[PDB]
Design a protein around this ligand. Sequence first.
Ligand code: OVX
Ligand code: OVX
Ligand code: CL
Lengths: 301, 305
Amino acid sequence: SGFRKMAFPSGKVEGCMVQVTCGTTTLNGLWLDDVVYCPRHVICTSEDMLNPNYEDLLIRKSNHNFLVQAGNVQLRVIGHSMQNCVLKLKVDTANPKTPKYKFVRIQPGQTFSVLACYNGSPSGVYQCAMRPNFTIKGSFLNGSCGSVGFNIDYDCVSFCYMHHMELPTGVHAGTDLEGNFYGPFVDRQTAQAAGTDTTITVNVLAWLYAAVINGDRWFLNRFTTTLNDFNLVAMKYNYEPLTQDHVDILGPLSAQTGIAVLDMCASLKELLQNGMNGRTILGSALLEDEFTPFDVVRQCS
Amino acid sequence: SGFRKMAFPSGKVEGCMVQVTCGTTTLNGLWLDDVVYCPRHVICTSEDMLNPNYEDLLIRKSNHNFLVQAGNVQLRVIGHSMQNCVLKLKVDTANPKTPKYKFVRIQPGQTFSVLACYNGSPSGVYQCAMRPNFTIKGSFLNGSCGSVGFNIDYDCVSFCYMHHMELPTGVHAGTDLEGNFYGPFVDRQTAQAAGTDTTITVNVLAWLYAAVINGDRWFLNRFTTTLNDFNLVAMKYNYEPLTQDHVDILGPLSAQTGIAVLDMCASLKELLQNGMNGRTILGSALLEDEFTPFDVVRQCSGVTF
Ligand SMILES: O=C(c1cncc2ccccc12)N1CCN(c2cccc(Cl)c2)C(=O)C1
Ligand SMILES: O=C(c1cncc2ccccc12)N1CCN(c2cccc(Cl)c2)C(=O)C1
Ligand SMILES: [Cl-]
């Protein structure tokens, strides 16, 4: 029993974190096999950040311009290349702690664990979700660039995020491990803003199913709804539209609790209309949207 | 920017988790040096749990009755002894991954990371607090016993909790690593209940300081209060008393934000008497009490391990 915001154990990722320095800039790198991945902006100076020409800045660098430190050991850089917004530094030593891994690009609503790092050293682990506006509400300070997001379903680590920047509203933007940004962001100091964010509806429904599995039924009601009437109401509360894919994904939780998806949608519409009236659901006075249907099944079962 | 419920990196503890089997019961063990620690109830059958005589049940066991698996390697048990509610299995191999560690017993209000494990394999890490009623609001299923709670102070892992049971309300009970239960609980299948819980006041204040550091100021006000007046309000709302020690601990956060502790108490008093009025603090519509003053400073300063 109980339902917590739970992160994956971070050990497999901790053994991959290194410190990358290029000139005066120091950030984190991810050392897998003989390659160290880090944000390409590590090569920028203060006067380069508005409109950097990364190809031009990179061509000017040699291997010895990159200092990579793994613990108290300096790794030797023997190659460097750029893939989109990530810099890949070939090193002369394969990481003996390299776990079984893969690079996966995630979609909005997906959740992942973030291992926040400073100077190549892990400081904390927390759970995040890719917001519908492609930002993440992380907890990051100066020096956290290169910190990664991942999932570890079984013993394979799927790396899905690398931290690049903090937007003016305090939210974060980054890339997948192939260097492609999530959202309409660029690795430049130019004026950029997160679009209006919305609530991840499918995740809220998953979390209501978690509450039912854990014995909470107060918010249930005798009503159902059509998918289209649900969407017309939910969009008025800035909730993401619920698609037939989301309804299908909730099928196993629906079968387990005996509550049809459109029946739970009617509970959600009522919760949006009435609020909680002094009550809580799984220890929360707000509707939680950073648990996916997969997270609920893994944690409750 | 941002403020998350953040656990310590779990790697140092992951390298200590093993699977302990005794008969039909399988749970988790903590392997440090040449000793594997686990709940002593691993030796009980369902009948034994009703009124167990652990000394009598243990005397009947030999070393080979304990199967310890570290990854895909079976460890050889060469001794077994009991310390309070923990069983200590001496093994023939010291754990090469043993970090610098200590066993510490924590106080209510103190937070720690829990590494939830099943079959000796870590499945998740989450941050929680020792409640004032000595339970933890954990997230645990069948097979989670022996999962541990810890903090990291510098480069040393301080183990503070080992999971033993789930109470009827879904909250959890366990011991320190010396086998002493937190709370008035016993390791037996008998009627037990969590007492009425209270809110950890010093932690709520620490979290309000975190909200201010992150740019949320709506709840601030021009008022201050006395410690005696505030403690009268705290008692009325099932909040733990705030002591001068708590006020002193909040000193650095008070100096950093310019909000004196008693000034933040007046914000808290107003929140208790009026609610949030449709507003949120750090994405919450409830006052969060599972961040200590140390957690707030650590997260807002980026201390690494
Ligand atoms: O190191 C950080 C950083 C990271 N995360 C959270 C922070 C909170 C406070 C202060 C600094 C940070 N930076 C430097 C790079 N940087 C950036 C600026 C413009 C473009 C690019 Cl790709 C990157 C940042 O946004 C900020
Ligand atoms: O493995 C668990 C367990 C743990 N945590 C959360 C769970 C949620 C659902 C089902 C089982 C669990 N047990 C077995 C031992 N056990 C117990 C029973 C009586 C006394 C003692 Cl000390 C211990 C339990 O309470 C329950
Ligand atoms: Cl309140």
